């Protein structure tokens, strides 16, 4: 099912704590205030505390913000969220008889890394839009798409709170709110980061490496074909506006034929990759792998960053981007 | 060897601290007191502290219980034992000149996760019986089987302490005490949890999934065949009383023939699984895997629990157990 | 569907012949009489004839019992049923214009080894409960589960007769009667005997053989871990009472994690075995294999019995069971 | 262990029924009588009844012979023994409180095809010698080898009866009596018939087929190499007299080197065959296969006889043996 509008009433006369004043936090706080909700901000004292104060919000330490709140949006990065939840939020939530904890990312709840108490409505309103894009579309009077989820319905009104927040943050009406789940949103997010993105970058690197090492192509010619021209961004725009296949009518018949035949040829290969990565997300295996990479001090993350940025392709890219003035 | 009785004398006039008043702790404490030994209990103030107080035991914080004790039985879950040992026990043991630390589980000592100091007798008395079963058999005047082990003989009497505790907790006489080790007991415990148990549950799930998806069998018929009837529990009783093969005489010849032929047919397949899991326990690989699952916050444990309890079979089981009026 | 109760009326004023006074026969006869049905017994003159006479039943030769009956329950072992049906029952059934022949086992009808005539309602009421368990639950006023099936609806009332017998034998109400079939019941029974049971015993034997031969474990330690303690029976009870996964909450987290990870790890391997054994049942292949083992004089059955009972594990089990004071062969 | 002599006393003052007056029966009966034992014969009224009568034995129907006997040797072919045991022996044995039933072949008892009652000593005295060979060696005052077994010790003296019969039939002293079993004797007999014998004949046929079809060798040359000369019988004699390897000293060094290297080269291949055939005997699988071949009316036996006797090698053998006058 889909949701095109909602009643804002379950959030009326409630103190709403936006924890974290980053990309998502600033935008979700600002727009909820513009729709006349009582919004405070929780944040450590960074630049982000200052900016929230400067944009007229009551700003507190995270534990205080949660103490004062009936509803909190935990909009901090996933990789620090567990520490902050356990030290500054969970102790306060032992006190509350009723509470609504919202997330924009399913990861930590989906894999059981954060388990709010039985009394807490655990809900998700997860945009598919960067944050600069959300401000832009709100200024134009338009909405954006979100995924909704409820892990734990303590109150019996968790879905109403989720729909309410979706209206509050300016997603609906004008955009859509899709009925989803914490597990589903985490799966979808990670499937992209672990399949089509890395397959795309690998394929582009292999194009460069084969063109240059085996066919005697200049680094600059190879870079200009494989990504360094505008090409990739104007195809990506037509995919979003017209459709992934519909968009192909603007290319030569030679191009259409080559892409269609090779897409069907290699579907089974990329399908096996997608199946294996999806299974490994859904099991919890990826959450264990990444948690243990963090606890080990990021040595694989560190070395793969070095090897990617010191690749023949990355070095040639640096020289070409210098030569073109970027 | 095996041991059928022992001298209780090495425990006489000694304070015996049972750390943890769970399944094993309650029973080992109760029976040691009934055999006239000076038993205190170490435990945080949970429900378990309340029950121990109500059953007439002096109860202390774990560090106090150890300070007051000449002998302690560390009968808490293996998954919290390292933290509790390091924070509440090891500091106290730096003080002691003589001490006996007993375990009912070899795991933490076998994989070096708990290394008591050189002055401490590190011993094991590990039952093969649930705890409800131990109380039942003590009330009937009968013993039960235990595995004995000694990692570290500081005193030169560690084996006497082990045999003594075996008598103390009512294992012997009447039952047996088998000469074993921390490594052997940990290996045996984990071999079951990693081979025949998961193979059994998997085989039962595959029977359900194939019957229902491929042969059009009703969920209810499939559940009633594969486990939801009494069948499994009365075969398990006859295996323990008469023997695993001897027990088969009570089934049809058709059933005997089918089971015998298919057991020999698939032995090599399940043997490969057993070999691989045993090797991976014995190396320490499983201890690293499980320790790292805990430190990562149990995400695989969490998700596999969800996937097992949300399986077609588990959902159908819930509906059928409701319909038959069993707890859900 | 499922059935929780039924009208007993289609069996009222009818003579019901229980053929065979073994585990299932004695119980189904006794309980049908206690519910006020006209029950006679057919049996050869064994100890079982004597016991039926002593428990107050009219007892006859099998052919006589069938001649006198409107309804018969053929509750004899599957491996002798074909001979007895062909010699003592089929000739009598050529005579009858109406008849209800009930089985507690689908095997012989499912694989076409017994094909009653077109005029006979061929029906199945198949318990999932041993027989000592059925008497126990009837004494407590409770029912038990059965599978119902109809191969041949001659009368147009075969399903009513099946539900009726289910009530008659004290399955319902209190228990359930599941709508099933001869083929389905035979498949389900044999799938267990050919997959999870032999896989379990093999896995337990391999645990013993590896622990003892490769890790230097004492026979007695290995036997106490793998089955010779109470362990298996109290897990089997909690599986039936709480559920197969729900039951795991009573074990250590270490135990839960080990079992869950390894169950998912090895599912595909045991699934292949289940697929292969199910296909071989459903084809009739197993019925041919077993029929030919019987006709050959049971030489594989005989030798596999010897090899199982003379295994290192079976010999050690005998010594340990002696030492603990349990029944020893 | 081994047994070189035994006390004949457990058979003294007992009626000994030899059932079957074939190769083994005639010889075991004759020699037991010559050692002063009370020997009667059971047999159907064939030529063999006549011969037993003519050689001075009391001869009866099989059931009568068993009724009159304290000890019987069931020395009839294995492939008829089950029928004869069930119809003419088992009914009589229901009556006996004590009895000793001896076999010269383990097959039927080993695979449970004949199961004498709990009260019967079920024993085996199994020669390794044809029967013409046993008469020959008794006339020379020498013994021969037997395997002893006991399936069922009802009396507690079954082993003494087995050793006694071994002395009775003139095996010991002079020869040996090896402690064995029904299963072991059946296994040993069938291992030969299912491994080295058929491997030998197959290898000889393959030598013929390859020489003739691929190397243009005349059928007569190929037959003269591979078996039709004396070669095979004089090697077989020296193997039995001197030893399987010791015997090789009489051949060229070229021959020794070729045989030693190729024996070690192919050991693993023939070992796999031996393992597979032994396992299939020991399980009871072969007993089921053969019983079902008989019940199906011998169609594989019949067709394989045709294909062996109608092979290019068998036809050429017939022409050559005609030409040499055999
Ligand atoms: Mg994404
Ligand atoms: Mg265990
Ligand atoms: Mg059965
Ligand atoms: Mg069953
Ligand atoms: Mg355990
Ligand atoms: Mg031979
Ligand atoms: Mg030569």
From Swiss-Prot, chain C:
Stored Pfam families: KARI_C, KARI_N
Protein name: Putative ketol-acid reductoisomerase 2
Organism: Saccharolobus solfataricus (strain ATCC 35092 / DSM 1617 / JCM 11322 / P2)
UniProt-listed NCBIfam families: ilvC
Highest taxon in the source lineage: Archaea
EC assignment: 1.1.1.86
Pathway linked to the protein: Amino-acid biosynthesis; L-isoleucine biosynthesis; L-isoleucine from 2-oxobutanoate: step 2/4; Amino-acid biosynthesis; L-valine biosynthesis; L-valine from pyruvate: step 2/4
NADP listed as a keyword: yes
Biological processes per GO annotation: isoleucine biosynthetic process; L-valine biosynthetic process
Keywords (A to Z) from UniProt: Amino-acid biosynthesis, Branched-chain amino acid biosynthesis, NADP, Oxidoreductase
Family listed: Belongs to the ketol-acid reductoisomerase family.
Domain (KARI C-terminal knotted) ranges: 181-327
Domain KARI N-terminal Rossmann stretches: 1-180
Major enzyme class: oxidoreductase
GO molecular function term, any single one: ketol-acid reductoisomerase activity
Catalytic activity: (2R)-2,3-dihydroxy-3-methylbutanoate + NADP(+) = (2S)-2-acetolactate + NADPH + H(+); (2R,3R)-2,3-dihydroxy-3-methylpentanoate + NADP(+) = (S)-2-ethyl-2-hydroxy-3-oxobutanoate + NADPH + H(+)
